[PDB]
Structures are given as structure tokens and as C-alpha cells.
Amino acid sequence: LRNLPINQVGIKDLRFPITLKTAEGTQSTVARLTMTVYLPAEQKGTHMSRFVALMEQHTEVLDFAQLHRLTAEMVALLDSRAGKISVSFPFFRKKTAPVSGIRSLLDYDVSLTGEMKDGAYGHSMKVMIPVTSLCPCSKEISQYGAHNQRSHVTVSLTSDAEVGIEEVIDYVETQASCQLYGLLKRPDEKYVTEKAYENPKFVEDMVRDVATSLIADKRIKSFVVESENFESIHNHSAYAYIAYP
Amino acid sequence: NLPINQVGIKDLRFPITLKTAEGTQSTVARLTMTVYLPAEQKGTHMSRFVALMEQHTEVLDFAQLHRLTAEMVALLDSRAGKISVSFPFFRKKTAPVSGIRSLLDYDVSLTGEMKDGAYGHSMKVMIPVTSLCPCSKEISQYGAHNQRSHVTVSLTSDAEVGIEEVIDYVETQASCQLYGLLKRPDEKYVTEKAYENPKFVEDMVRDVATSLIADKRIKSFVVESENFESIHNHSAYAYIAYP
Amino acid sequence: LRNLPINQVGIKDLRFPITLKTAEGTQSTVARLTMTVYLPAEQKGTHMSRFVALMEQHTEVLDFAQLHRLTAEMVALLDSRAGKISVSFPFFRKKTAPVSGIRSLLDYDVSLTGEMKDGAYGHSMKVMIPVTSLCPCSKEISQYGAHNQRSHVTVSLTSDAEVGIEEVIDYVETQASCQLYGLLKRPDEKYVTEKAYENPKFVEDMVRDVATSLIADKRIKSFVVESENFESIHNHSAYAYIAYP
Amino acid sequence: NLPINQVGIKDLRFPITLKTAEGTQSTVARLTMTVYLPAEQKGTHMSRFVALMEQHTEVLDFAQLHRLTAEMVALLDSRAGKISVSFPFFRKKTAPVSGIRSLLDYDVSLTGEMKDGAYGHSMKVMIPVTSLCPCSKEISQYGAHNQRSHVTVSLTSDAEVGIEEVIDYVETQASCQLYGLLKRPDEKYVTEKAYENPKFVEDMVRDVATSLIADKRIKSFVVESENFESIHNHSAYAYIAYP
Ligand SMILES: [Zn+2]
Ligand SMILES: [Zn+2]
Ligand SMILES: [Zn+2]
Ligand SMILES: [Zn+2]
């Protein structure tokens, strides 16, 4: 009676090397894990070492099928009816400069979550995409130039069928004033400077353009789109978010 | 054409004066200030959030947060919006043997929210405590591993719950609470007290949540605890949400 | 013999409310402190609670005279021949918008250090100043627009006579493509957009212009100037620093 | 007209493969890559630092760092420059009773530096350990407060000192070292061992520094330890520099 069920208990911020397979290829990265299970009112404690045992023994490449298997195996190993695994890591993608064709990596921040509830599995994801934002107000009121800055666009979603990390990346980067590259030659820098100027967007415009795409995707049951613009003229950020439905 | 749930400014740093039941203090806040944006409206008016903060010189407390949130949604011409303010919060404590006084620091957020002329508020408090392991003590012939823990309480009520109240709910339940200033007899007392009161992370979250369930001002809450286990390089963690 | 002196021992990241007085006025802020003393080979340990005792008992406003007194009192209280107090905090200054005249605060990050060595006192400081940087290459090669971004300029210095926090701020902000304001009306935004465009500067130009000023100041015995530009076109930073002499 | 000590790129994130004495692993690095800039030269050539990393596919180790730093100062047409690479580093450990194996994570930086055709290298390793308080144990009738500690070793040598070597120097000296995976008999062993080997932060830094002084490959070093005291909300800290 005095006793209460605990929504989630286990371990948090275990750092662990992982290999990840997505549609575009396989890559090695380093993750932080939070691994937890439901604890019924009657049980005193969970078994904390079994969460680490699980990661040490499962050597398969991570993908959405493997995260499912892993979460199902965890709840079984932990003797629980419910649990979550959240895995956060940097994610690299090969990019090509818009004029030179010179290739370089860009880095994104990703989290993947698997959740079991009484035999039912659900999965969600989050991706932070760094883009260039350029202010339409600045350009319009100014006889020359326009302020611009890096922005972090964060998409969180839950879907029934799998949605690829790269697909979330493309939905955002398609919409940005201009996207980022690690390696830019002189013509590419001329290209990005001009495109961003040509395509100014408020933080409001950015969240709306991405949200439109996500609403259209039949896989997506709910989402949040945030955008944060590190305003180059202020020392605080412009911020917006849309949650759906 | 889509409405935007919230749009405005994030992580504006700003000095504030804060009034609570035990007194007034000066601290430094981060603010996030946002309003609802209707489907066909192009943008909000970003400079007005800063203007509002620059103009209002009054001490912060729950009544002044309400007033600032009202005035914001008015000034921005919106039907809804939210103000969240985060800051370090200091409280004077008394060492348990010497009685020598010293401050402790806690992390607090308060949030006010207007939706179509109705107001709601909520708060969050991170209280650092000592945790000590019952399995370690029971299995070992001497000693018990122990570590700092960060206990985070988020709650929503209608009547005001004081920051100090949330702190007390938690410190009362910890294996032992923290102090900045401890003499040798104080160190002895805290060492023994934690060792006499071992708690798993499970125990800590159940013990705090029971106290909050008993407080009938509280509509809903989350209690989390993260224990920086001194024998691992990762943490034990738990949370309860209610209802 | 087996025993070794310890350069510095004490406490680190004590968070503590402070009141600070500089040339422009007095303000309340929150600091992190690191307070340490020298430990001779022969002594087993220092007295850790006395560092907190010291902060709890000294209720005077902080300024360079008070940091001196505080460091001298610490080494005496700790029974040591040498020690350091480092105090880090956000620092607010009142600013005025360049067209409207509308006033707002801006926030800077500051550290002040006091050091005793056998009766001799020395003090140093560091200030991070967030500014706008605008790329000359971008503007010159582009038919319109120029990429720009927040930059953090960090000045560290040691001096014999006191150098005010605001003076370090002015040395940097005087040199920037354009400086930041919290509150900007439409004409002010037109003003800052244009000024930054009119005054493009590489990270190299920025460190050089600030360093020139610091070399000229007779108070300053040594310094480091760093600048980091959060390139709005990349996901890494452009960075430079000058150390002198 | 002023020369600039170092100019280039900072916190480029980049996946790397790392080879050490115990094996090869894949990790993710932050890089800072800079060159000296002569007084009358206007700017460096920023895109070339990224090109250099994109082109060189070789496994990282001390010989490859030297080679990358040589090639950089060549490609940038500078007389001096520095490459620093920071990453999490994993090592497989054996629990002290069960022998069950599990990884532990450490934070590493390696730095290479060219000055007028001469090369130097240096390294930094943060090793997390358990610390346990001798005063707490001595004064208390039972128990002893203990906590995670972050021990950071920075060193410069000419002959290569392995990352695992620095880790061993430190773990050997801690009240007890950390493991990710511990069974009940392992938890008992580590609890007792720390309690049998209490050390102040002073003790830890002297004990490590003595080991490093004895390693005649080492030209200079700094040992710091920060102990996240489980009875306070602040840390004990010490450092030694040598010579
Ligand atoms: Zn703008
Ligand atoms: Zn335990
Ligand atoms: Zn540029
Ligand atoms: Zn102690």
C-alpha cells in the first residue's frame, strides 16, 4: 500500500561505442544510453547490472529492427512488463559542395528511443540539424546586407513504420535559407552567401515549412519541430515550435 | 497555413530579485518568453519580450509572474503564451552539530502560462543530496559506497507551493542532506547518519513521491533522482509521474 | 622525501551570490569560486572548511581591492605561504540602441583571479565579449549579401594597476564589425545590419585590432586575445589567438 | 602589424579510427587545427584544414599525428602549427571477483606541434576513479563518505607514452577504480577495498605524481584531481605541476 509503482528505473548516461546501419551505409559512432524498466509496487528494486550486461553481450549493428530486439530482450532480461532504451549519438553524413563538387562530412545529433508496454513496441526519434537562417526583416529594411546565423532545427517524431534519419535530415535541409558544409571553396562560398540572401526565412517560416512536410508523411503519428536561431545581432535566441497533432 | 504553439525568445540572461517566504535575494535568471501565433499571422514582435523585462522592475514571486505573463500576452496581442525563468536559488542552512550556518545552492525554474485568459503555473527544483547504497552496506564487512544525487521535483498546483517547501520534502527523505560548511563533529554526524539510512534510487523517488501525494495543493508532479554512483562511471536513475 | 609539495589545493566550483562594484556602479550576480593554497611537502593536508568559512564571513562588496584583501586573508586563515582565488560570474552592462536610444542590458562572462606568493600579490582577469563578425571574403565575392555570425572574443590579461571590466569590454566592442544589443527597434536593426556589412572583419583582423589596443595600455604586462567565430556557413568555428609578450 | 600565434579551425567533429598498444577502435573526435600567421599576412586558408582531414584515411596513432601535423604546416605554407584531437576512449576491464569483462570510458586529448621543422607531442587523460575520505572513516563509528573523482593527467614526452599506461598509473593509485559491470561479490570487493584504502585529494595527486616522476620518458606533467565530495555541493581539488 505505502508502496508505489515506478514509471522507469535503471541506468542513465552510460557511454558506449556503437555501429549504426541506416539506408545510406554503416558507421561507427559513440552513444550515451539511458535504459530503464517499469517497477511494480510490490517489488523493491530492479537489477542494475543486467542493463550493462545487455550492451556488453549484444554485438549486432544498430538499426530500427535491432533497437526493437534490444528493448524486447531488456524487458525479458529485467523481468518486467515495460521499459525504454534511449540512445543518443553524433551522426555523420557525406555532403558535396554546391559549385566545386568537393565532398566533406557534416555532423548531426540524433536520439533513437524504443519502448515496450506489455508486449506492444513503439519507437520515436529526434534529430538536430544545424542550418543557416537569414532574416527577411534585415534584408528588406537594409539598403545592403542581411543578418544571418547558424540555427539548430530539432525534429522529434513518433511513427509506426520506420522513418530514416537521413529522411528527417532532408525534410529540414530542403527548407533552410541555406544548409551547412564543412568544406567550401571560393565559388561555393559565393553560392551559399547568395542562396541564403535569396531565401530569407524567419524562425516562424522555418518551423512551418518543415511541419507541412511532416504532416504530409503518412508514417508520422505525432511530432514536434523546433527551431532556434542564434541571432547574430542579439545575445539571446529567436525560438519557435510546433507540436502536432 | 499552420498555427505555431509557441514563438518568442529563448535563454535571455537577466538579473532578478526574488521574494519567497524566507526572504528576498538577488540572483541571475535565463528566460524563455513565448506566445501562440495564429495560422495566417506571419511573425511575432520579438523586441517586445525584451522591452517587457526591461520595464518591469518589481521583485519576482508567483503573483508577479502571473502579472508578467498577463501583460506579455496583452503586449504581444496573442491569446496564449508562457514565461519560464530559471535561476540558482540560495538557502541558509545550519550544520547538524556545530550549528555553524552556510548557504546551499539549488536550481529552480518557475513557469507561468496564459491560455485564453486562464492562468496556470508550475515549478521545478533540483535538490542535491547524499545517497548511500543498502546493498553495499549489507554485503560488505565494513563501509558502504555513497555519492551525490540530483533529485528533481517538477509540480503544478493552484495554491502556491514555496521553493523551500519542495526543498524540505526532499532533504527530509535523503540518506543525508548536503551542507557547504561542516566541522569535524558535523562530518562525523553526516557520515553516520547516511550509513544508518541507506536508500536505493527506487527508495528515494517512492519516499519523496509519497510526501507530494500527501500535499493536497499539488495537482500533478514528476520526481526524478539521478545518483552518480561512486563505483561506476554511469548513474542510477528513476522517476515517478503522477497522477 | 617521498612527499611532494602541492602547487594548489582547496575547493572548486563553489557557487555563491556576490555583489560587485566597478567604475559604472554596483550589481548583484552569482559566481563560481575556486579557492586554493600551496601545500608544503611536509604537511599532510589543508583545511577545506576554512575556504567556505571565509566566503560566509566576508560580506563586503567585491572589487579589486576587496579581492586582494580576500586572498591575503585566505592564505593567513589557511596558514600557507601562497594561494589563489578565482571568481567567475555573468556581468551585466546597460546599453543604448544606436538609432532609437532604447536601453537594454547585455551580459558578459567574467573571471577575476587574485594570487599571493610569499607576501607578493598579483591579479589577472578574463572577459568574454559576444560580438557580431562579418566575413570580408563573403561580401567581396558575392554580388549581394555577406555571411555573419555571433563571435565570442575572450581577453585574458595580467596588469599591475587595475584595469576595469568595462574598459576591456570597450577595447573589444570598439573594434567589432558590430556589437550586440538585447533590444533593437526597426531603425536600429537597419543600423546594425548596415554597419556590420560596412565593417567586415576576419577572425585574424579582430584579434589584431584588439591586441594593438592592449599592447598600447601601459598597465598590461601580458595578455591573450582569442576570437571564435561561429561560422554561419559551417558547423565548426574559425578561431585565432594572440599571446603577448 | 602583428603575427598571430595560432589561427585555424576549432571543434570540428569527425569520426576517427585509433590504434594503441592494446588494439584499434573507432571513436568520434573534436579537432582544433591551427597555424602561425606572420605579421604582414592577411589571413590563413581555412578550407585546407578540412581538406587535410577529409583526405587522410589512415588510423590515428602518435606516428600518424606527427605526419598530419607536418603535412598541415606544409599545406598551409606556415612555419608552425598545432593539431589537437579530443575523444572518448574505451578500454575493456575485468571485474575483480567474477572476472566478468566490461568497457570503461575515458576522455583523451593528443596534441602535435611543429615549430620550424621540429616536432613535439603531448597528451591529456581524464580517468574517473572512486575516492574515499580518511577523516570521515577515522572520526565515524561506521561508514566513510566516498564519491566519484576525475583525475586528469597532462604530460609531454619524446618517446611515446601509451594512453593505457597513463590509465594504469592512475587506477593503481585510487582508493578503488571504476567498472561498468559489477556482480554482488564485485560490489562487496570494491566497497571494502575503497574503505581499506582511504585517500585525500592531496594523497591522490602526490601518489600519481610520484609514479610519473619515476617514468623517465616524461619531460613535464600536470596531475589534477577533482573529487565530487558526496557530503557537499562543491568539490575538493588539487594539482601538481612538474618540473
Ligand atoms: Zn532580424
Ligand atoms: Zn550499490
Ligand atoms: Zn567567410
Ligand atoms: Zn571528508
From Swiss-Prot, chains A, C:
Q: Which pathway does it serve?
A: Cofactor biosynthesis; 7,8-dihydroneopterin triphosphate biosynthesis; 7,8-dihydroneopterin triphosphate from GTP: step 1/1
Detail the disulphide connectivity of this chain as listed in its UniProt entry: none
Catalytic activity entry: GTP + H2O = 7,8-dihydroneopterin 3'-triphosphate + formate + H(+)
Q: Spell out the molecular function terms from Gene Ontology.
A: GTP cyclohydrolase I activity
Top-rank taxon of the source lineage equals Bacteria
List the HAMAP family hit by this protein, alphabetically.
GTP_cyclohydrol_B
Assigned protein family: Belongs to the GTP cyclohydrolase IV family.
Q: Per its database record, what is this protein's job?
A: Converts GTP to 7,8-dihydroneopterin triphosphate.
Q: What's the protein called, per UniProt?
A: GTP cyclohydrolase FolE2
Q: Which organism is it from?
A: Neisseria gonorrhoeae (strain ATCC 700825 / FA 1090)
Gene behind this protein:
folE2
